[PDB]
Design an enzyme around this catalytic site. Structure first.
Site, PDB file in Angstrom:
ATOM      1  N   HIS A  40     -43.203  18.485  -4.352  1.00 56.55           N
ATOM      2  CA  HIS A  40     -44.103  18.426  -3.432  1.00 56.55           C
ATOM      3  C   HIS A  40     -44.606  18.487  -2.682  1.00 56.55           C
ATOM      4  CE1 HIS A  40     -44.820  22.926  -3.009  1.00 56.55           C
ATOM      5  NE2 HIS A  40     -45.708  22.084  -2.105  1.00 56.55           N
ATOM      6  N   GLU A  52     -63.232  22.490 -10.598  1.00 55.44           N
ATOM      7  CA  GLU A  52     -63.885  22.574  -9.341  1.00 55.44           C
ATOM      8  C   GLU A  52     -64.281  23.735  -9.210  1.00 55.44           C
ATOM      9  OE1 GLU A  52     -65.337  20.812  -7.026  1.00 55.44           O
ATOM     10  OE2 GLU A  52     -64.310  18.919  -6.709  1.00 55.44           O
ATOM     11  N   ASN A  54     -66.781  25.227  -5.680  1.00 55.31           N
ATOM     12  CA  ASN A  54     -66.423  24.608  -4.756  1.00 55.31           C
ATOM     13  C   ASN A  54     -65.994  23.274  -3.891  1.00 55.31           C
ATOM     14  OD1 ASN A  54     -68.841  25.285  -1.694  1.00 55.31           O
ATOM     15  ND2 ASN A  54     -67.025  23.421  -1.309  1.00 55.31           N
ATOM     16  N   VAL A  57     -69.001  21.029  -2.114  1.00 52.64           N
ATOM     17  CA  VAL A  57     -70.005  20.692  -2.836  1.00 52.64           C
ATOM     18  C   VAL A  57     -69.954  20.237  -4.582  1.00 52.64           C
ATOM     19  CG1 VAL A  57     -72.382  22.076  -3.465  1.00 52.64           C
ATOM     20  CG2 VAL A  57     -71.016  22.431  -1.112  1.00 52.64           C
ATOM     21  N   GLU A  62     -67.965  18.995 -12.558  1.00 50.82           N
ATOM     22  CA  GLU A  62     -66.893  18.074 -12.297  1.00 50.82           C
ATOM     23  C   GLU A  62     -67.070  16.535 -12.366  1.00 50.82           C
ATOM     24  OE1 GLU A  62     -69.840  18.930  -9.623  1.00 50.82           O
ATOM     25  OE2 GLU A  62     -68.543  19.702  -7.800  1.00 50.82           O
ATOM     26  N   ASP A  84     -38.834  22.445  -8.495  1.00 57.35           N
ATOM     27  CA  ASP A  84     -39.871  21.779  -7.801  1.00 57.35           C
ATOM     28  C   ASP A  84     -41.155  21.374  -8.848  1.00 57.35           C
ATOM     29  OD1 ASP A  84     -42.113  21.385  -5.976  1.00 57.35           O
ATOM     30  OD2 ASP A  84     -42.298  23.103  -5.460  1.00 57.35           O
ATOM     31  N   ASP A 171     -50.917  37.530  -1.568  1.00 55.36           N
ATOM     32  CA  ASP A 171     -49.692  36.768  -1.960  1.00 55.36           C
ATOM     33  C   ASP A 171     -50.291  35.373  -1.731  1.00 55.36           C
ATOM     34  OD1 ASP A 171     -46.993  35.083  -1.875  1.00 55.36           O
ATOM     35  OD2 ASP A 171     -46.301  35.782  -0.142  1.00 55.36           O
ATOM     36  N   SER A 172     -50.043  34.112  -2.719  1.00 53.28           N
ATOM     37  CA  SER A 172     -50.638  32.676  -2.214  1.00 53.28           C
ATOM     38  C   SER A 172     -49.619  32.574  -0.753  1.00 53.28           C
ATOM     39  CB  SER A 172     -49.867  31.595  -3.347  1.00 53.28           C
ATOM     40  OG  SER A 172     -48.573  31.673  -3.672  1.00 53.28           O
ATOM     41  N   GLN A 174     -50.294  28.330   1.918  1.00 56.36           N
ATOM     42  CA  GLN A 174     -50.343  27.158   2.066  1.00 56.36           C
ATOM     43  C   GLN A 174     -52.012  26.254   1.792  1.00 56.36           C
ATOM     44  OE1 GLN A 174     -52.702  23.835   4.117  1.00 56.36           O
ATOM     45  NE2 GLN A 174     -50.069  23.277   4.293  1.00 56.36           N
ATOM     46  N   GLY A 175     -51.666  25.360   0.894  1.00 59.48           N
ATOM     47  CA  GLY A 175     -52.561  24.790   0.104  1.00 59.48           C
ATOM     48  C   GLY A 175     -52.946  24.773  -1.321  1.00 59.48           C
ATOM     49  N   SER A 177     -50.093  25.695  -3.004  1.00 60.40           N
ATOM     50  CA  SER A 177     -48.621  24.809  -3.858  1.00 60.40           C
ATOM     51  C   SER A 177     -49.556  23.739  -4.793  1.00 60.40           C
ATOM     52  CB  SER A 177     -48.302  23.486  -2.461  1.00 60.40           C
ATOM     53  OG  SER A 177     -47.372  24.172  -1.885  1.00 60.40           O
ATOM     54  N   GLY A 178     -47.737  23.575  -6.072  1.00 60.86           N
ATOM     55  CA  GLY A 178     -48.429  23.256  -7.415  1.00 60.86           C
ATOM     56  C   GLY A 178     -49.496  23.667  -8.180  1.00 60.86           C
TER      57      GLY A 178
END
Ligand SMILES: NCCCc1ccccc1
Ligand SMILES: [Ca+2]
Length: 223
Positions: A40, A52, A54, A57, A62, A84, A171-172, A174-175, A177-178
């Site tokens: 999804h 990563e 921050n 920043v 990175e 999924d 909990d996890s 939104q954002g 995801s994956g």
């Protein structure tokens, strides 16, 4: 992540951010050239951001590598979220060190009661919104399949597990995801779905990665 803690910079070295001009989904590095995420999270034009902490920043560890191919599971159903899972191949191989490292795939499915680490840059509030710029972590147990099916009547398939706390607050979200659910040093889950975040008797639902290991292995052997 709601009700978690700040991980610490580069303490979850397999965690990736998928960026399309902004962070939109987490992911996990499974070897120097492949990432696994949620189907999804699929999008065209993905840049994979490794090393990563921050995400707003540039801090020095990175590696930003563009994706060359994305493969969504052939039986992904976006209405039920069954299967999924997606693989992303990087244009070039990541440079691996203590701070950017791949996570091992499981040889065994993890059992109910196993403690796991869930991580991501998603929302930190169950009601309302606040997005962290640094990586958040949560320890949570895998829930029994009967309590998972009791929380989500007629929605849990054998390719899903619940993890978290039936009384909410952690909990996890939104954002997230994956992103990864790592148990005993193996990738066992992918943040997939749930009814809101950190709600009572509505725990997180996660893609069960041990079911997909041979599709992952075959697919990376031929692509
Ligand atoms: N209740 C579990 C966390 C739900 C969440 C995960 C992934 C995407 C959106 C929400
Ligand atoms: Ca950064």
């Amino acid at each position: 992540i709601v009700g978690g803690y700040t991980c610490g910079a580069n303490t979850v070295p397999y965690q990736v951010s998928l960026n399309s001009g902004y962070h939109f989904c987490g992911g996990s590095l499974i070897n120097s050239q492949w990432v696994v995420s949620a189907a999804h999270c699929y999008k065209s034009g993905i840049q994979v951001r490794l090393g990563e902490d921050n995400i707003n920043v540039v801090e020095g560890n990175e590696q930003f590598i563009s994706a060359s191919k994305s493969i969504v599971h052939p039986s992904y159903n976006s209405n039920t979220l069954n299967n999924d899972i997606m693989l992303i191949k990087l244009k070039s191989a990541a440079s691996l060190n203590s701070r950017v490292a791949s996570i091992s795939l499981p040889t065994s499915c993890a059992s109910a009661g196993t403690q796991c680490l869930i991580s991501g840059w998603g929302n930190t509030k169950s009601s309302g919104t606040s997005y962290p710029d640094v990586l958040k972590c949560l320890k949570a147990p895998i829930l029994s399949d009967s309590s998972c099916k009791s929380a989500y009547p007629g929605q849990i398939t054998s390719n899903m597990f619940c993890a978290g706390y039936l009384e909410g607050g952690k909990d996890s979200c939104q954002g997230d995801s994956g992103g990864p659910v790592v148990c005993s040093g193996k990738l066992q889950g992918i943040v997939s779905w749930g009814s809101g975040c950190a709600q009572k008797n509505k725990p997180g639902v996660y893609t069960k990665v041990c079911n997909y290991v041979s599709w992952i292995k075959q697919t990376i052997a031929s692509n």
